[PDB]
Amino acid sequence: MEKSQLESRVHLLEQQKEQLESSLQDALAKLKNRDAKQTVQKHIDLLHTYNEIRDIALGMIGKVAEHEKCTSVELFDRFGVNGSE
Amino acid sequence: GHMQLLSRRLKLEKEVRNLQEQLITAETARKVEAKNEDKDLQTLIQKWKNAAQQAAEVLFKPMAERIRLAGGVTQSFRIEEGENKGQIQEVRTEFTMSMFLNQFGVPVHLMSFDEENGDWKS
Numbered sequence A: 001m002e003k004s005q006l007e008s009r010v011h012l013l014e015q016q017k018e019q020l021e022s023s024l025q026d027a028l029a030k031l032k033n034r035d036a037k038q039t040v041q042k043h044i045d046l047l048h049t050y051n052e053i054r055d056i057a058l059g060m061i062g063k064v065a066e067h068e069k070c071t072s073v074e075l076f077d078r079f080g081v082n083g084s085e
Numbered sequence B: 001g002h003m004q005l006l007s008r009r010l011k012l013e014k015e016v017r018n019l020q021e022q023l024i025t026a027e028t029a030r031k032v033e034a035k036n037e038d039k040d041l042q043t044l045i046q047k048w049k050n051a052a053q054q055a056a057e058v059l060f061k062p063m064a065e066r067i068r069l070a071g072g073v074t075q076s077f078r079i080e081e082g083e084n085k086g087q088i089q090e091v092r093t094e095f096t097m098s099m100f101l102n103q104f105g106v107p108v109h110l111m112s113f114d115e116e117n118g119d120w121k122s
Helices: A003-029 A036-067 B003-035 B038-068 B097-103
Strands: B073-078 B088-093
Touching (some): A003 B003, A036 B038
Antiparallel strands (some): B073 B088
């Protein structure tokens, strides 16, 4: 690669970087909260926890349902849940 | 020379990757805000947590008693020193809620029993 050619790649990277800083500013402008990393992480941790504890709860309620010889849904009220949750 | 240019290419390439990553994050945040479900998720977590705890207490109690009426729990390890080197060292102890929850694959941080105070943790 000649020096010339390398200068051309470096100037393209400069313009790529500028355009990305501009696109990022526009993307952040659409957010109520500009700390996007906090927003996304808080959501990921809540979804994690929710999927895990509902799974576990369904497992245990299913075992109680086995001992009582019934379908799991029949015990949902006793445990304070329903199937749209 | 050209090493200043080479060094600047590498620095710009890193900055571009970092900005590309921030851009995705900012796009994801926009969708997370539009869904607006964090409150739903917190509410739902307490409901299902309350359910799992209640169900754990119903299942645990007679399980603990069945176990107890066949020796309880055996804890085992191998003896590594002394004239008994090789033998496995055994013991017996009661089945606890925490063994139960572990038996049910419940991460300690999700749901835990305060084995001393005899109730569930926040």
